[PDB]
């Protein structure tokens, strides 16, 4: 259980980390789905002017 006294906050927190180990490996490179591009970015037309 989480057991706090009367002067601590009853709702404590947990920060969850993740790393990888030395066993870890990656292959078959692809482009990231974390980013997209619907139109041209702003001032990208001004890089040509």
């Amino acid at each position: 259980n989480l057991i706090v006294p009367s002067e601590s906050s009853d709702t404590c927190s947990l920060i969850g980390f993740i790393a990888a180990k030395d066993d870890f490996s990656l292959r078959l490179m692809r482009d990231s789905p974390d980013i997209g591009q619907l139109d041209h970015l702003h001032a990208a037309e001004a890089a040509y002017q």
Binding site: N1, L2, I3, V4, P5, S6
Partner: protein
Amino acid sequence: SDRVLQLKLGNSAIVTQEAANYCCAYGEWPNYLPDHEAVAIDKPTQPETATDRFYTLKSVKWETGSTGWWWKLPDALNNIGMFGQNVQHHYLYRSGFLIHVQCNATKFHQGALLVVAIPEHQRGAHNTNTSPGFDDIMKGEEGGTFNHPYVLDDGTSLACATIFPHQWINLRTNNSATIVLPWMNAAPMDFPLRHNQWTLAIIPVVPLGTRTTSSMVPITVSIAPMCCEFNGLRHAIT
């Protein structure tokens, strides 16, 4: 230095930061059955990671009016995981145990736990000549509450219960007792469904007391079988 303790068994592992020590019961560490002590002639299955790991029992609410809790081994574990399936499929077993009882509270709570592992705890019923039946002894995963823990429910004394392998969870000092039990039977192996060698006993010698906001303080028990053998394969019973 001895307050921190990590117990790596199988895929399970338990760290604890307020530990006293870990009691190797009667100075004896668990081992497999040697050939000169062996009786069953067939080759025992020794899974070594499917059973030799911490099976965490259900927590019990450590309260003011609590009398105690007891789990009989391997009766607490005869239906849990791959230890339970090896129990149901085999006539014999030989396994030590690594009991790690977890119970913590704040630095404002007080209390003392007699975490004591009783070998061959033949219980007695109170104020009757009828022996305790099957339901009174073989509680299973739930365990049983002591009726009169001051006499350990067999007419003996709680005051002398420290002759058994025991540790104390004093909520002032530590928060985890650890008792490493060997194979304690006159026979080398035994039938698990009708006999229990060790009985973990957890007793409120000093009750839970504080003056702060009454959070639930439970007692969690994590019993790991050690050096499991299993002879006599058949169908399951459950």
